[PDB]
């Protein structure tokens, strides 16, 4: 099971913004005793016995009184405030010399690019942990939002311009994305991974992954993909010159399938390309139920070969 | 700072100006001319309306 | 049918108050059933219940129904309807007819956001919120959710403007403002916020409308436009709503504390600095909901500052409130338990809130569930305790039946467990990372199952509480002990009725001095004397099928709207109906007699509601040309060069001018007896609007064959802001046409004139508003 909480301490962001909560815990422990323990009070002590019929001493307010309790919420926004400004300013401050990498968000998947590596890859986005990386975030259709709690807080994907968001990776694992930003009847079937690694181990992928290209461990699948599927699908592990589908050059390094939703394995992969819509309602991918089961069987052993060897995601700590 | 104090100071003239003319004293003024009195503090109203909202959203893209 | 005739008719104030509250509150109980739906299919992971678009249509359903059809409806125009003229000491509202429409408007946009289950593409399914530019893409019944929306403006506005002037013109003669129950000053700081704030909403709804409907855009990035203007314009109301929700509950909260602790309120005047505090607060804020979408640093720092200064206000009106229960003797009644179940959720509800406004911690917070916690943590167990506070409290009085207290108390209990049980546990999925909006979620997600599991038996327990909230009102209203005048033993005037009030309200008349805001209190004390009413002096306002006729035929207008491309036959038709029945509704009398019209300010009521009116139209081109500006000084929007020409607009700035010199005169000589001279101006005031129209026409036509406002933004904007000028010429020509009719017929004398102080005032407002235009648009 994952543990996912915004309380994690997993990335800069978090660490930065902790020290907000104590304060925020502090003001509404007091602020609940006096005013709710007031109220407690007032319900206790002045209960009416049903015979009493002689009214209460007539008090219209009590002028200091109302100063008081004027001055001193004002002091406490004042203090949040001032904690909140400061706070902002430093997550917000842009990291000189972080890793660019490039998020695109599309209806119902994300598309990364790594415009110093020269890489690309889809749905799951690898880093290393220690290095500031910066997230250069747009769509290309409607508003989205890049959520990864275990690491920072979102940032929306407009379309027409770029965002940003800044922070470095501590803790190595596993970490679930989500969008957050209605974006249609897929909104909830629109997540990812990011998959934190040593920096020593990130190194490692992203050579391996532009040293070679992807493996062909079934030519017969070769060529039923060619048939099928090359049209919305590269497999160059690089920017094609048009964007349809997610890049599948290093799907069998994928821990995930579909955006992140379900778990990638030969039968969730077959159920997927005989029925996307089956899972994520709305997908603009169509299904494959015609083809043959030799020819599905042999499209999967290909597929699940595109990958590069010495890596496990999925034995990370998941976040 | 200062934008925000600026923006702080349009809401207040808008308050202010909607205060002067909408108070239950000032709408039992009688004459032919409170109508054109008040339609032209509609006028300023809108100018300065307008121009506080604006300057906030240009705030918002100056990065 | 006897009886349907009478409600398809009425424009008593009371009939009116109730139609509104029992429509809200069928609102509450099927968007409630909509959350049960909800709750169902998010009882545990991968559920098959309610999914995709299915469940964002029930979503975006549950929304927008409890927001605009109940919570905001029945506090203000239900209650209020029945009860401010009441508090008032009046015998009925500012402009009872004006006050029928509003409701027909009312159940009119109710219909059209529903019907869309009819369609292709059924309920809309973006989200209350309808982002661009999802939903200006979506198959979904988003054409009816906007037409709604524009519908449900006019019922809103109408609605506002008629508080404000009966406020304003009908208190009882000796109250002054200051002596009005804080309720009333509640639904008075309600009224003008949302008269000036709608305007953000009903352009965000209008410009995603037509774009949809004829591809004009200011928010396609293609032509430099600006997606986020969209939630700039949408906010701009959409935190006001929220005020504007909380007000009048906040004000029942102040009139249930006094009643119920024998005590007079504490702090009066404070409670009333408080109410202005949030009003203009409340409209410096909006930006809280944009975060995330990458506005500069500084931008957000300014709205995070605002909004925690929110606070100290609404801090201060409640422990004026909790004052008020201090050191009185609490009769333990339902209503006041409502009242403490209201106050102790609150505070957790507004701390959450100012979390919500520091940035840093929002970036985490936003669209997740410690925002669904954070709102229905407010406007459930508070706006919506609050609604049933006011239920209770007032229904002996609009029912003239008691309901047993024991049922009553039965359904606080269990809508106040059952809040508990369904949004603690959301908090707490908020900090676990689950964003809000799914319609389901894994189940290798830890805590998520057993809290939404837990989430889901809450809303069950609500569930019960709505059945015991019906039963209790059925038998209350089947076996029910009858009421008395004041059950409660209130010192406000609404308890110096009869129960419920006759047509006329008040049977005696009504001392002239009012000590404080307690008038029972005080004459009780003095042992004043009441002294019947003469029959002679009461005058009740005629009944009149045209606001329903009226209503009903803009509705059929907005259905041809949402349902068909525009623009087609059908706008027409009902359009020219409508028309119709506005010639007639202002060709009716008022009353069947002659009457006296003495209002406090010794403005009409025409009038009064008019000026009134005229700050949602101040509202509505200052945000637009706020965005327009915005636009055009950051680059994005650019003339091109077949711009319509200036010496065309400065022709135009002298016939519309001159109009308002013809249209002054002629009111002049209306007052001094003159009635050919007058009949002359209006008459020529007319001809000269329908030459700036005819000249604005042809400069429409031609700019059209130059340029496109689907290629160009400044184009789309000109379209946008002077083509809406130009609707309101023709209104305000209309409302011009209705006074000469009435000259036409003779209903227009030295006595009444109010239709032609109304159109003429909204003319002077149109001239006022071209000047603007010439120079942003022509000049500029
Ligand atoms: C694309 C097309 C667009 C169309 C859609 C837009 C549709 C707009 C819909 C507007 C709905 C407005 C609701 C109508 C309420 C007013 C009804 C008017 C008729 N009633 C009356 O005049 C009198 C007759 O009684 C009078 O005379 C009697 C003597 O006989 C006396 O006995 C009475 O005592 C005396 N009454 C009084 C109070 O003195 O009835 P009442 O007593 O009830 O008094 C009621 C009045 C008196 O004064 C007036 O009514 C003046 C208002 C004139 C405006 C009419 C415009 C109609 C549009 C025509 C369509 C074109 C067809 C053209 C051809 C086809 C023919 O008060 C107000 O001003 C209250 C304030 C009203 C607000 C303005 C609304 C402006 C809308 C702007 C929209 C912007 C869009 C902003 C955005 C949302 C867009
Ligand atoms: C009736 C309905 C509502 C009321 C009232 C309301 C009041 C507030 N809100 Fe809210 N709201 C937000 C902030 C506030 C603040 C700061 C207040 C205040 O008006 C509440 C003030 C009341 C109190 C504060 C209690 C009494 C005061 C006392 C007792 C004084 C002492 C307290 C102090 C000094 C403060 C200390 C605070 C600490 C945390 C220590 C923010 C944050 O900036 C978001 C963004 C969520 C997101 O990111 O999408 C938001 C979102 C919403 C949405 C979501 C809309 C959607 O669909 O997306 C709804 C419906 C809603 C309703 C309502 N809201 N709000
Ligand atoms: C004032 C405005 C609101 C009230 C009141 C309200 C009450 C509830 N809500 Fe809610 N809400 C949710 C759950 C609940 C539950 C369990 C209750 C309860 O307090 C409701 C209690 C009321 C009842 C349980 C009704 C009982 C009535 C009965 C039993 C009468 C039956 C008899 C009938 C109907 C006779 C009529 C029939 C005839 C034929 C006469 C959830 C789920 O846990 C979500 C998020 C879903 C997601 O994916 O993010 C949510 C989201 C929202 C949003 C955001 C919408 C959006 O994202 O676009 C808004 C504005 C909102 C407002 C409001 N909400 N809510
Ligand atoms: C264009 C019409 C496509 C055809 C032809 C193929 N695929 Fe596709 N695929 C397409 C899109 C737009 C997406 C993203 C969908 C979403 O909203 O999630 C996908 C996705 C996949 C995936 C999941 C990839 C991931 O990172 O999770 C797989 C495994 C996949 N597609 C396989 C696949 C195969 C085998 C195809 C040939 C039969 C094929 N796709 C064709 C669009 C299109
Ligand atoms: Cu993308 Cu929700
Ligand atoms: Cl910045
Ligand atoms: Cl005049
Ligand atoms: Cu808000
Ligand atoms: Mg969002």
């Known amino acids: 099971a994952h543990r996912v909480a915004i309380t994690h301490p997993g990335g800069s962001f978090n660490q930065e913004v902790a020290f907000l909560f104590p304060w925020v815990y502090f003001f509404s422990f007091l602020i609940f005793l006096v005013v709710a323990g007031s109220l407690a009070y007032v319900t206790w002590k002045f209960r009416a016995r049903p015979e009493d019929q002689e009214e209460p001493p007539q008090i219209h307010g009590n002028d200091r009184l109302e100063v008081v309790w004027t001055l001193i919420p004002l002091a406490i926004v004042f203090v949040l405030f001032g904690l909140t400004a400061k706070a902002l300013i430093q997550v917000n401050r842009p990291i000189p010399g972080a890793m660019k990498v490039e998020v695109t968000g599309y209806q119902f998947w994300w598309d990364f690019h790594y415009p110093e590596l020269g890489l690309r890859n889809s749905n799951e986005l690898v880093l290393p942990a220690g290095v500031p990386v910066e997230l250069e975030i747009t769509s290309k259709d409607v508003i989205h939002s890049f959520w990864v709690p275990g690491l920072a807080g979102k940032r929306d994907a407009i379309p027409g311009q770029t965002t940003r968001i800044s922070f470095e990776p501590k803790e190595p694992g596993l970490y679930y994305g989500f969008c957050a930003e209605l974006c249609g009847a897929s909104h909830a079937r629109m997540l990812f991974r990011v998959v934190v690694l040593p920096k020593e181990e990130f190194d490692r992928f992203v050579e391996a992954a532009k040293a070679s290209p992807a493996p062909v461990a079934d030519e017969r699948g070769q060529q039923v993909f060619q048939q099928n599927c090359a049209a919305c699908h590269g497999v160059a592990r690089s920017m094609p010159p048009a964007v349809i589908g997610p890049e599948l050059g290093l799907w069998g390094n994928r821990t995930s399938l579909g955006a992140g939703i379900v778990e990638n394995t030969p039968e969730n992969l077959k159920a997927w390309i005989r029925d996307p819509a089956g899972m994520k309602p709305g997908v603009k991918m169509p299904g494959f139920p015609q083809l043959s089961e030799e020819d599905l069987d042999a499209l999967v052993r290909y597929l699940e070969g595109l990958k590069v060897e010495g890596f496990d995601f999925g034995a990370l700590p998941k976040f | 700072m200062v934008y925000i104090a600026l923006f702080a100071l349009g809401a207040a003239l808008v308050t202010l100006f909607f205060y002067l003319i909408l108070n239950p004293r000032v709408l039992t003024t009688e004459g032919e001319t409170f109508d054109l009195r008040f339609v032209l503090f509609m006028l300023l109203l809108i100018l300065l309306a307008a121009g506080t909202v604006a300057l906030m959203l240009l705030i918002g893209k100056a990065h | 049918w006897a009886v349907l005739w009478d409600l398809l008719t009425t424009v008593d104030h009371k009939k009116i108050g109730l139609m509104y509250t029992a429509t809200a509150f069928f609102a509450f109980a099927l968007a409630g059933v909509f959350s049960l739906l909800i709750r169902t299919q998010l009882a545990v992971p991968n559920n098959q219940f309610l999914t995709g678009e299915q469940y964002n249509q029930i979503l975006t359903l549950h929304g927008a129904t409890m927001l605009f059809f109940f919570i905001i409806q029945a506090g203000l125009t239900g209650f209020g309807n029945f009860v401010v003229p009441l508090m008032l000491g009046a015998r009925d509202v500012a402009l009872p007819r004006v006050n029928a429409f509003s409701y027909w408007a009312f159940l009119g946009a109710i219909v059209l956001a529903l019907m869309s289950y009819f369609f292709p593409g059924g309920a809309p399914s973006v989200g209350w919120t309808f982002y661009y530019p999802f939903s200006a893409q979506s198959e979904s019944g988003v054409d009816f959710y906007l037409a709604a929306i524009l519908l449900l403006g006019f019922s809103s506005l109408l609605g506002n403007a008629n508080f404000v002037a009966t406020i304003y013109n009908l208190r009882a003669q000796g109250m002054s403002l200051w002596k009005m129950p804080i309720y009333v000053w509640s639904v008075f700081a309600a009224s003008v916020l949302n008269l000036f704030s709608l305007a953000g909403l009903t352009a965000a709804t209008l410009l995603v409308l037509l774009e949809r409907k004829i591809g004009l855009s200011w928010f396609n990035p293609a032509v430099g436009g600006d997606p986020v203007l969209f939630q700039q314009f949408f906010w701009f109301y959409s935190h006001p709503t929220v005020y504007v929700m909380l007000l009048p509950y906040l004000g029942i909260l102040a009139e249930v504390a006094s009643t119920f602790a024998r005590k007079p309120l504490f702090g009066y005047r404070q409670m009333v600095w408080a109410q202005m505090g949030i009003v203009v607060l409340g409209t410096m804020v909006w930006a809280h909901h944009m975060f995330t979408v990458g506005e500069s640093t500084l931008f957000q720092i300014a709205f995070a500052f605002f909004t925690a200064l929110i606070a100290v206000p609404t801090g201060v009106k409640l422990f004026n409130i909790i004052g008020t229960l201090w050191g009185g003797k609490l009769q333990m009644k339902t209503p006041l338990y409502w009242v403490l179940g209201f106050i102790f959720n609150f505070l957790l509800g507004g ?100 809290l939404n599991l837990l989430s889901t038996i809450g809303a069950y327990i ?139 300010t010794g403005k009409s009521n025409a009038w009064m509601g008019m000026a009134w009116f005229i700050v949602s139209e101040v509202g509505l081109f200052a945000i637009l040309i706020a965005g327009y500006l915005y636009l055009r000084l950051s680059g994005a929007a650019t003339p091109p060069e077949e711009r319509p020409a200036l010496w065309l607009a400065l022709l135009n700035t002298f016939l519309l001018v001159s109009s308002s010199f013809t249209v002054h005169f002629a009111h002049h000589d209306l007052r001094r007896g003159r009635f050919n001279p007058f009949r002359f101006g209006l008459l020529v005031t007319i001809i000269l609007g329908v030459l700036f129209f005819l000249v604005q026409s042809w400069e429409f036509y031609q700019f059209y064959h130059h340029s496109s406002w689907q290629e160009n933004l400044w184009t789309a904007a000109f379209f946008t802001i002077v083509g809406l000028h130009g609707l309101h010429v023709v209104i305000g020509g209309f409302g011009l046409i209705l006074a000469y009719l009435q000259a036409l017929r003779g209903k227009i004398t030295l006595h009444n004139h109010g239709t032609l102080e109304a159109a003429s005032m909204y003319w002077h407002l149109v001239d006022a508003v071209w000047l603007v235009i010439v120079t942003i648009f022509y000049v500029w």
Not at chain 3, 383 to 409: C, H, I, N, Q, V
């Open chain 3, 351 to 450: 701390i959450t809130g100012v979390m919500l406004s520091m940035t840093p911690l929002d970036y985490q917070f936003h669209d997740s569930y410690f925002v669904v916690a954070h709102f229905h943590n407010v406007l459930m167990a508070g706006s919506g305790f609050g609604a049933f506070a006011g239920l209770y409290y007032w229904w002996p009085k609009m029912t003239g039946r008691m309901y047993d207290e024991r049922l009553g108390r039965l359904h606080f209990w269990l809508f106040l467990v059952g809040y508990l049980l369904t949004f603690l546990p959301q908090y707490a999925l908020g900090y676990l990372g689950m964003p809000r909006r799914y319609y389901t979620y894994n189940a290798d997600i830890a805590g998520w199952p057993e």
């Open chain 3, 462 to 600: 609500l569930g019960l509480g709505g059945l015991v909230w019906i039963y209790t009102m059925w038998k209350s209203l089947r076996s029910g002990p009858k009421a008395p005048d004041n059950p409660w033993g209130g010192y406000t005037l609404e308890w110096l009725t009869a129960s419920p009030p006759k047509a006329h309200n008040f049977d005696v008349k009504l001392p002239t001095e009012f000590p404080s805001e307690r008038p029972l209190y005080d004459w009780k004390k003095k042992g004043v004397e009441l002294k019947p009413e003469d029959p002679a002096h009461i005058h009740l306002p005629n009944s009149s099928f045209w606001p329903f006729y009226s209503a009903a035929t803009l509705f059929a207008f907005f259905v041809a709207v949402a349902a068909l491309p525009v623009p087609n036959v059908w706008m027409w038709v009902f359009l020219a109906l409508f028309a119709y029945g506005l010639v007639r509704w202002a060709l009716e009398d008022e009353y069947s007699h002659p009457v006296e019209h003495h209002t406090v």
